[PDB]
Design an enzyme around this catalytic site. Structure first.
Site, mmCIF file in Angstrom:
data_model
loop_
_atom_site.group_PDB
_atom_site.id
_atom_site.type_symbol
_atom_site.label_atom_id
_atom_site.label_comp_id
_atom_site.label_asym_id
_atom_site.label_seq_id
_atom_site.Cartn_x
_atom_site.Cartn_y
_atom_site.Cartn_z
ATOM 1 C CG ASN A 43 -11.580 5.440 0.460
ATOM 2 O OD1 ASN A 43 -11.125 4.758 -0.480
ATOM 3 N ND2 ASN A 43 -12.585 6.293 0.299
ATOM 4 C CG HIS A 58 -7.528 2.548 2.551
ATOM 5 N ND1 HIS A 58 -7.813 1.759 3.651
ATOM 6 C CD2 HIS A 58 -8.673 2.778 1.867
ATOM 7 C CE1 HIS A 58 -9.122 1.562 3.619
ATOM 8 N NE2 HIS A 58 -9.682 2.158 2.563
ATOM 9 C CB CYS A 114 1.107 -0.554 6.236
ATOM 10 S SG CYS A 114 1.709 0.654 7.453
#
Ligand code: A1A4A
Ligand code: A1A4A
EC number: 3.1.2.14
Lengths: 268, 269
Positions: A190, A192, A227
């Site tokens: 995804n 991330h 982040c």
């Protein structure tokens, strides 16, 4: 790898690969942290969870709810060498309404000796609004049937290193590493940023001389903000003392905090 | 993993880990390149060579000589998914006095189908002065006893993609990624930057939209200079072309000194 005889924990063996070792001829801390994440995903798959970064379960997926880490605490006594076999045992546990706790025990498969241990706190939140709405009693029933009912802690000691309040680093920092960015290897399905990348970024501000004369024994890290793929991180460090340090990861621009933690190192 | 029945090649199986997959739910190109390096190291150990990444022999170690890559060429037809078992077969071969060639064949262990293949050229060089030198007779006889005597090529075709001259990228570049630095995870026992890191840096200048609509099929990369631990890299890309092709260039920011150059070919999903 497989669930144990009682089905309340998961075991798995790993051979240490050549690209997984560092300047010590032994596994890097990111290799260790990666192996914890791997056995954690396989445990989640073996019990019916989502296999992605979050072990979502039904009714959680219905309410757009995910499990996110709030704290990581790792202690290593012996780093495995290239070709060594390391056995890791992981288990899940409910921490009331606050969330979940995931623990690990690292062992040398040849000597059966404990060569490391880890603990982590996981909070529940909405994937879209990112608000920590840890309220759900029926959701607690869908994951409790996989947790041991009696407490099983990797760090049992009353008020230990894994439950300590981490202070915020005062400027100026003694050591620093600016302009840290994630790459496509650091991103999941995804897109991330992998949880292990933040650990590596925390250690990028430790001087090379400390790494060449000491080995990392303890690392406690707090996850405040995630982040993004296009974000840039600044790594800060100050000697608080064996050697001990205080760390801080923040976005290069605004100085928005994403992480803070402590590391304890030992002479070789 | 183990050497085959004839002892002239090495086989090994790998399960694809959860942290090894990317946005496609399949293994990243750095995972694939890492698995090639792992089976290459285990082949080198199983035959008595050094396991530090230089595959050094007795006479080579006495004269401070090491094996360094000059070219990497990887072709992938199907990226393995999380939990899949991939079998890789590697073997070495002498290329006269120019150096060595290392080849790989990737297969799906369930279907036995070839899902990828790779080739690499290795030059001999003095460890300290970095001056390349021609393979001597004493050194050649020590590694030849582990190579098949008849030619065995992963890319056999007459004038294939792995033996093509790569041009230098004219400025301005269409796409770019500046300020790339290696981390402690990217360094080996002797603190040198891993060969797989350069591949990842080449692909950092490919736009996210290309990665989301295409899969990497071919990658040819040339190694000109090694990036030091405290060095900073600039990644450059320009579309040269269903399929899409690009020209790449890795250089240091503080001087523009070239370290790598290559080409990538992508196909629609
Ligand atoms: C030290 C880094 C990590 N260690 N573990 C991680 N993840 C996991 O164990 C799995 C199971 C819970 C959901 O994700 S991240
Ligand atoms: C694609 C990156 C690499 N692939 N392979 C590499 N190394 C190796 O296979 C071993 C053979 C002896 C020298 O090191 S580097």
């Amino acid at each position: 790898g497989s669930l144990t005889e009682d089905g309340l924990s998961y075991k798995e063996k790993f051979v240490v690969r050549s690209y997984e070792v560092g300047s010590n001829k032994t596994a890097t801390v990111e290799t260790i942290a990666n192996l914890l994440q791997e056995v954690g995903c396989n445990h989640a798959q073996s019990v019916g969870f989502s296999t992605d970064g979050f072990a979502t379960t039904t009714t959680m997926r219905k309410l757009h709810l995910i499990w996110v880490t709030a704290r990581m605490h790792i202690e290593i006594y012996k780093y495995p060498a290239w070709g060594d076999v390391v056995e890791i045992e992981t288990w899940c546990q409910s921490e009331g309404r606050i969330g979940t706790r995931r623990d690990w025990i690292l062992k040398d498969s040849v000597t059966g000796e404990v060569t490391g241990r880890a603990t982590s706190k996981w909070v529940m939140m909405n994937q879209d609004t990112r608000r920590l709405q840890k309220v759900s009693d029926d959701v607690r029933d869908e994951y409790l049937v996989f947790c041991p009912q009696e407490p099983r802690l990797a760090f049992p000691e009353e008020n230990n290193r894994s439950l300590k309040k981490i202070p915020k680093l005062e400027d100026p920092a003694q050591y620093s590493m600016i302009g840290l960015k994630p790459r496509r290897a650091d991103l999941d399905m995804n897109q991330h940023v992998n949880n292990v990348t933040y650990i590596g970024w925390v250690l990028e501000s430790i001087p090379q001389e400390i790494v060449d004369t000491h080995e990392l024994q303890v690392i406690t890290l707090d996850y405040r903000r995630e982040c993004q793929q296009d974000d840039v991180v600044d790594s800060l460090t100050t000697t608080t003392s064996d050697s001990q340090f205080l760390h801080l990861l923040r976005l290069s621009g605004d100085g928005q905090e994403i992480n803070r933690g402590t590391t304890l190192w030992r002479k070789k």
